[model samples]
Target chain A: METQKLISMVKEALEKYQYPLTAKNIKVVIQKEHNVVLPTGSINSILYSNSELFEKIDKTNTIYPPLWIRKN
Target chain B: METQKLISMVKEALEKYQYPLTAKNIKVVIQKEHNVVLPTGSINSILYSNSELFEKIDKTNTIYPPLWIRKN
Candidate 1:
């Protein structure tokens, strides 16, 4: 999928559920819903390196990976 | 499984991953690791009404289901 398209997909998938989704959770959702296996690198790229669109969802500590919530 | 045992199992599985996990994600992880199918109700019980061991991880809004992180 195209880069922007992939970002949009992640955003869509993340919103469908009742909670923020981890990268893996988003990956699973995208594959199940659209028959696409997003590469971890691409998801992470949207998640962190391109991290502005999504918000991190962990507050207990900083060591664990943070779940992602899309920005309003 | 016992209630506390189930709680512990969910905690273990949640920690195994890098990010906070949604209820569905936790269910999948437990099944994969231990060959058990956790009922959605039981999981939800642990998640909300019985919700103290885990912390909610969504920040953008409160309408969607919240992803959960284990409190330290």
Candidate 2:
């Protein structure tokens, strides 16, 4: 898979959530909605590598995702 | 600091090491090399979220960085 494409896909997932999304939530969203299987390693790479696109917030609520917000 | 930029800095640090890096190491590298302070929470979020870019290969070598290897 194209790395850039995967990155875009991840961004899309985060946008859809419109809130802090955990890494697992992002993976699930990408798979359930986008029908693409993204390994945790790959997903982490994107999120870790592209921090400007996303920000990690404290887990205010466990019910919520993983306290990751999308950044411009 | 830009999230993406921070992630990129983490990536650069990881690349420079040319091996699996731990969250703590990544943070240190970013701070020392890029002059940025990345929180453990932030670094963990990135590493935990993106799986493809990094794989946690277990804490085999404690002396070395954490078991995180760049994929693509």
Candidate 3:
């Protein structure tokens, strides 16, 4: 419903996992892991643009989620 | 030409940087470092599904990249 809510969920999940999370992972985490289709690229953009915030955390076992979709 | 080649490039870049790389990073390296848009989600799927390989690499400097997208 709200982007901030998604952002908050994503941040919380990232903190909990302490690893790099993918957009799909985050989406699932927020939806199934958390119940929220989030825009396909919502999470990726956040991580890509906000690399600074991400750098502050422990990324020892990070991941980039599954790009489940294919493009032409 | 082959998925193995892309995987190899991804592996090599991972080794060289030794930091958790985004699909974009791996993609860029393949394009620039190795010279190859691979199927967009291919890298993400590899990272997500084959997390063991990713775990083997040092992710002290991992990232998730920006969501860079919005959905309806």
Candidate 4:
């Protein structure tokens, strides 16, 4: 699926859904809405690794916690 | 670090720097380049939270996969 719509729609949906939406659900949405079939690996890549959000991951400490981005 | 160039440039510069620049170093960049000061937690908030990117987290199941986004 396209990254722009995927990220924007996912966040917009989360605002309406009021809960965390996983890559799988998003995949389902993309399939249903955009008619795009995305592999779970790709979805993971899109959500965690690919999005600008992951780059937000802090790299200060040698050992830190999981990368968590707060919803806006 | 400041969020805009911090995230975009970080990703953009990663293409150039070819390394995962740390949040602290990014903060240094922000301080030096953008003349802004950001706490680690605030940087996390701005990059992950404030940015529209994080709305991508999937919310289908109670217990399931972690969020992942693919880089373009």
Local distance difference test values of all predictions, in order: 0.71, 0.68, 0.52, 0.45
Question: Candidate 4: lDDT of B66?
Answer: 26
List TM-scores for all candidates, in order.
0.51, 0.49, 0.48, 0.33
Best by lDDT: 1
lDDT of 2 by residue, A11-36 (tens): 88888875677776788888997786
Tens digits of per-residue lDDT for model 1, A1-72: 688888888888877875566677677677767887678667878888665788776544432335677876
Sort the predicted structures by lDDT, highest score first: 1, 2, 3, 4
The C-alpha local distance difference test score for the whole of candidate 1 amounts to 0.71
What is the CAPRI rating of model 1's predicted complex?
incorrect
Residue ranges of candidate 2 with Cα displaced over 4 Å: A59-66, B1-66, B69-72
DockQ of candidate 2, scored on C-alphas against the true complex (2 decimals):
0.08
DockQ of 1: 0.08
* Segments of candidate 3 deviating more than 4 angstroms: A1-3, A41-72, B1-7, B21-25, B40-72
Candidate 1 lDDT score at position B55: 74
Model 4 clash number: 20
Clashes of 1: 4
lDDT of 1 at A35: 88
Model 4 DockQ vs. reference: 0.04
